[PDB]
């Protein structure tokens, strides 16, 4: 049940007024939300894509990306806009404004949970409960693009192609990494359950050994995480690669991993799924959007709280999105 590959033809097509920049489905109800660059959020039932259930405009500028999280219970919908405002709504079948957030001086890029990344050179961390300013930090001399939180550790890749691994209580950089000739577009941790097979008991306690990185140079690179000590180890804080993955004809936008088969999207009208074992491209889907394929989304297989159902969805710049069932 964990080795499902979607069919070539799309199940159906969600027509959107403007270019799709973020897609996220509800982990519980069969509904999806798409956030665009015109400040428009469209809510569509998964088996009823005819009429827009909720067409909302609460953003003056473009929404680059957004994600959702379920409380530990309701669902949190965190959206962002380039005029430096962050919104959290309530799903009843309409968006009810719960709270607003501020603290970023420039265009905000993405969110994570609440934490966020921007272009204002400053890392700022707040609390959903508090809503006040808690943490400020400078990641590098040059600002970062892709960040994520895994318990207490954050990896960050900057415009100067610099990876840094930091720990929230220690406040020190565990390791540094690099290797590309281009700025990194996305970086993601790789966990266990060859990528999910641990090597030693110390790394089993750690849980992270590899990490995936994608940039605009049509390359996917997996990086080995060096052994940390917390306090940094000066002699054991350098990343290293073992395999170079290519095949895309344009920039790699977003990547997603599940089991052993990983999915990626590129501006060559294509979405490609690979295997981390053999490296051969298991499938290449062409002609998904008239414009570039901006984002992909699937049910999160890495989290047991969310059910990895039979769903996939992708967005595009052609003012349309493709959702795949069966």
């Amino acid at each position: 049940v964990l080795k499902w590959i979607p069919r070539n033809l799309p199940s159906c097509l969600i027509n959107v007024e403007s270019s799709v920049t973020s897609v996220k489905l509800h982990p519980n109800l069969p509904i999806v939300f798409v956030a665009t660059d015109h400040g428009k959020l469209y809510a569509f039932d998964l088996f009823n894509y005819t009429i827009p259930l909720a067409s909302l405009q609460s953003h003056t500028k473009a929404i680059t990306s957004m994600d959702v999280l379920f409380t530990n219970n309701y669902l949190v919908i965190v959206t962002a806009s380039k005029d430096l405002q962050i919104h959290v709504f309530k799903w009843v079948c309409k968006f009810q404004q719960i709270r607003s957030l501020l603290g970023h001086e420039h265009i905000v890029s993405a969110v994570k949970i609440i934490a966020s990344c921007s272009r204002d050179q400053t890392v700022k961390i707040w609390d959903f409960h508090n809503g006040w300013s808690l943490k400020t930090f400078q990641p590098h001399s040059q600002w970062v693009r892709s960040i994520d939180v895994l318990g207490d550790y954050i990896i960050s890749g900057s415009h100067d192609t610099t990876l840094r691994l930091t720990h929230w209580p220690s406040g020190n950089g565990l390791s540094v990494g690099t290797g590309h000739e281009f700025p990194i577009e996305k970086v993601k941790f790789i966990h266990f359950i060859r990528f999910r097979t641990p090597s030693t008991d110390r790394y089993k306690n750690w849980g992270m050994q590899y990490c995936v990185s994608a940039s605009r140079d049509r390359t996917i690179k997996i990086w080995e995480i060096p052994l940390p000590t917390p306090i940094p180890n000066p002699t054991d804080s350098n990343f290293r690669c073992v395999l170079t993955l290519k095949g895309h004809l344009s920039w790699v936008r977003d990547i997603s991993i599940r089991g052993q088969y990983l999915f990626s999207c590129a501006d060559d009208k294509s979405v490609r799924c690979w295997d981390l074992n053999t490296g051969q491209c298991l499938h290449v889907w062409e002609k998904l959007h008239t414009g570039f394929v901006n984002c992909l989304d699937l049910d999160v297989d890495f989290d047991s709280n969310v059910t990895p159902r039979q769903m996939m969805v992708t967005g595009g710049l052609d003012c349309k999105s493709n959702v795949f069932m069966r």
Partner: protein, 711 residues
């Protein structure tokens, strides 16, 4: 005396070269005549005498002049003596011809990129043999001829392939001196007792190759100094040590010169005092059959990579040579200062066909002819002045294709790119404009804050400069009207390709600081494999020595002067940290040719002498940016005013075309037209209309509120 000559010298002063060449030939052949009859001996002697007379009295004339001279020298000595012809040669003794002495070589695809590859042919080997004799006769050499004849190429062929000689390459600047020569010989000669200067070797002579000796400038009293210095070395067989004041005798050195004809602008005529002591040869353009054979060999070597059409080498060779012939025919340099045609750009055409074929998908016939036509548009019809000659070039391509053996041929429809995929193939206009728009919007959101237009002319020029940039030794000249966007185009293509932007932050600057910046760039390139592209404007150049340095690295494949000493020591130390003398320097040349790209953004058509230099024409892909067109600017104005809704009583087309008409009238009432006035007008109109319409909108809102209150 009455025939045509270049660098006109008296007939009294060529007897030196003639007699010395004849005596050296006889002294070389003397120990073979001991078993020869009187008549064969006399025939050999009179053949060598006739050859010496022809190649020392008519050396500065053309081929038909040489044939007239050979028939006159045949009829002026009688028919009893041994005849002499164009192909005549003495070799083991027996009368022979040059036609049976050429070798055969079939190079493969991956060495056409080498600029020093020399193809054997008939005139090349004839001039090779006479160069050997005239250099061994202890006589100075000067080679003068039209640009593109391959003077440097023939020089490297003659000097690299001799066990008795080496090569030291020095290139003169506009402002020259006497320690240039001493610096050039410093790395290859040593002082011995310094009473005597000798080459570092002992068995092989060392020869100083200098090129473009017309380039140095006279002083205020009508006299230069470097040619007098050369005269002193190659006549007195010595010179004076400047700080030490002693005579230094040099014996095994040789002086060989290369230069342009004096009729070229910016090239002075020398005094006959210096050319008196030397030997002059005219290196003219090769004939049609020689070029046909050369490019037949090149096309065979390039279609080795595609074995399906090996029998189509010969028609494409005929087409290329013929097309070059009428391309030189239908216009010349008398109309514009950049219509200089040479075998250099045909070689670069072969190079472009090579890289397009190698970096491309599976090819068929019609694809190959259309690629050839696209490259012809790329390299021949790219710096013209109108569309009439462009359609003439198109129909010329059509007729040469149908006479030497269809699809579309025009470059505006043939769209070849390398950004849409990993292979160099035909692409889609909508996909390219979407990719360019996305790249420009992310560039704007990231680095440069200009909310700026994208249109078809500038994306075509982006494709042009990207095609020029992706090649090796890819350096292009962007000349157009100011504020057209050439610098932003270079920055954009550097960002998309991956090259990082470096700029010289210049009076208040000097050669020391500029060469420090250059050496930092060179060290970064050699160590980190850094992709360097440096941007030069008009204000960035003040001395012609800068242009001389770029002209040296461009006409050559390297800089043979600024890379020496402790810099070489630390460079080789770092290279051996990363990793023969000649092989190491050749790999340095290859990596610096593959990892450096210079751009000039010059708007003025010093700049006139820059474009007029044919040495600068060597590895400059001169792209004619030009001025904007009425339709193009109607498009850009329509795109710019789209963000401002102002239709009241459409009217956007009317306002943009009436503004176009007014500035056309203004240009006619007051050469390129700078579009800065246009864009300033559009920006001011947009901002003023938006601001004052917002102010009048809130004023009318207040008036409406008052009217609703009072009504």
């Amino acid at each position: 005396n009455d025939l045509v000559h270049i660098l006109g010298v008296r007939t009294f002063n060529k007897l030196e070269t003639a007699v010395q060449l004849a005596v050296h030939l006889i002294s070389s052949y003397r120990q073979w005549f001991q078993n020869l009859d009187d008549k064969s001996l006399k025939d050999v002697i009179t053949l060598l005498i006739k050859r010496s007379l022809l190649y020392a009295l008519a050396g500065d004339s053309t081929g038909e002049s040489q044939r007239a001279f050979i028939q006159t020298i045949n009829t002026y000595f009688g028919h009893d003596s041994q005849e002499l012809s164009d192909y005549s040669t003495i070799v083991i003794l027996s009368f022979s011809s040059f036609c049976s002495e050429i070798p055969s070589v079939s190079l493969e695809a991956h060495e056409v990129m080498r600029p020093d590859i020399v193809i054997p042919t008939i005139d090349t080997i004839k001039h090779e043999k006479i160069f050997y004799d005239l250099l061994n006769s202890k006589r100075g050499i000067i080679l003068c001829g039209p640009p593109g004849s391959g003077k440097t190429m023939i020089m490297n062929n003659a000097l690299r392939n001799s066990s008795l000689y080496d090569v030291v390459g020095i290139n003169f600047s506009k402002d020259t001196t006497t320690e240039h020569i001493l610096s050039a010989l410093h790395r290859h000669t040593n002082y011995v007792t310094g009473l005597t200067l000798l080459p570092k070797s002992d068995i092989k002579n060392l020869v100083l190759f200098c090129d473009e000796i017309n380039l140095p400038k006279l002083d205020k009293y009508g006299s230069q100094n470097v040619v007098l210095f050369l005269r002193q070395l190659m006549e007195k067989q010595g010179f004076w040590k400047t700080p030490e004041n002693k005579w230094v005798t040099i014996e095994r050195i040789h002086i060989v010169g290369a230069c342009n004809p004096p009729t070229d602008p910016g090239r002075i005529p020398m005094s006959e005092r210096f050319t008196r002591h030397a030997a002059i040869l005219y290196l003219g353009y090769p004939s049609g059959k020689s070029l046909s054979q050369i490019y037949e060999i090149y096309y065979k070597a390039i279609f080795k990579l595609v074995p399906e059409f090996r029998s189509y080498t010969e028609p494409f060779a005929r087409a290329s040579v013929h097309l070059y012939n009428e391309c030189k025919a239908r216009y010349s340099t008398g109309l514009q200062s950049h219509y200089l045609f040479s075998p250099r750009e045909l070689t670069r055409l072969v190079r472009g066909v090579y890289t397009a074929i190698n970096t491309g998908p599976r090819q068929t016939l019609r694809s190959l002819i259309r690629l050839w036509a696209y490259e012809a548009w790329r390299i021949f019809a790219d710096r013209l002045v109108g569309v009439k000659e462009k359609n003439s070039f198109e129909q010329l391509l059509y007729e040469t294709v149908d006479k030497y053996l269809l699809g579309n041929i025009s470059s505006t429809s043939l769209l070849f790119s390398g950004l849409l995929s990993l292979d160099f193939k035909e692409v889609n206009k909508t996909d390219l404009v979407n990719f360019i728009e996305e790249r420009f919007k992310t560039f704007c959101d990231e680095e440069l804050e200009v909310p700026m237009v994208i249109h078809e002319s500038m994306v075509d020029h982006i494709l042009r400069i990207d095609r020029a940039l992706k090649q090796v030794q890819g350096h292009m000249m962007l000349i157009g009207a100011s504020r057209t966007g050439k610098t932003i185009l270079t920055r954009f293509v550097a960002w998309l390709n991956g090259l990082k932007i470096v700029q010289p932050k210049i009076r208040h600057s000097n050669l020391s600081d500029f060469d420090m910046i250059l050496k930092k760039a060179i060290s970064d390139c050699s160590l980190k494999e850094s992709r360097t592209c440096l941007i030069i404007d008009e204000s960035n150049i003040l001395e012609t020595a800068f242009l001389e340095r770029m002209n040296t690295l461009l006409a050559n494949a390297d800089i043979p002067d600024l890379f020496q000493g402790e810099e070489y020591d630390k460079l080789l130390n770092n290279l051996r940290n990363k990793t023969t003398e000649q092989e190491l320097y050749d790999w340095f040349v290859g990596e610096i040719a593959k990892n450096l790209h210079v751009v000039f953004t010059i708007c003025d058509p010093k700049s006139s002498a820059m474009i007029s230099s044919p040495a600068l024409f060597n590895r400059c892909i001169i792209n004619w940016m030009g001025d904007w067109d009425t339709k193009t600017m109607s498009q850009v104005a329509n795109n710019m005013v789209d963000v401002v809704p102002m239709e009241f009583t459409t009217i956007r087309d009317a306002v943009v075309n009436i503004l176009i008409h007014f500035d056309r009238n203004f240009y006619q009432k007051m050469n390129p037209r700078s579009p800065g006035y246009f864009i300033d007008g559009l920006r001011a109109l947009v901002k003023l209309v938006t601001a004052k319409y917002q102010d009048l909108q809130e004023n009318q809102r207040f008036v409406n509120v008052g009217l609703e209150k009072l009504n």
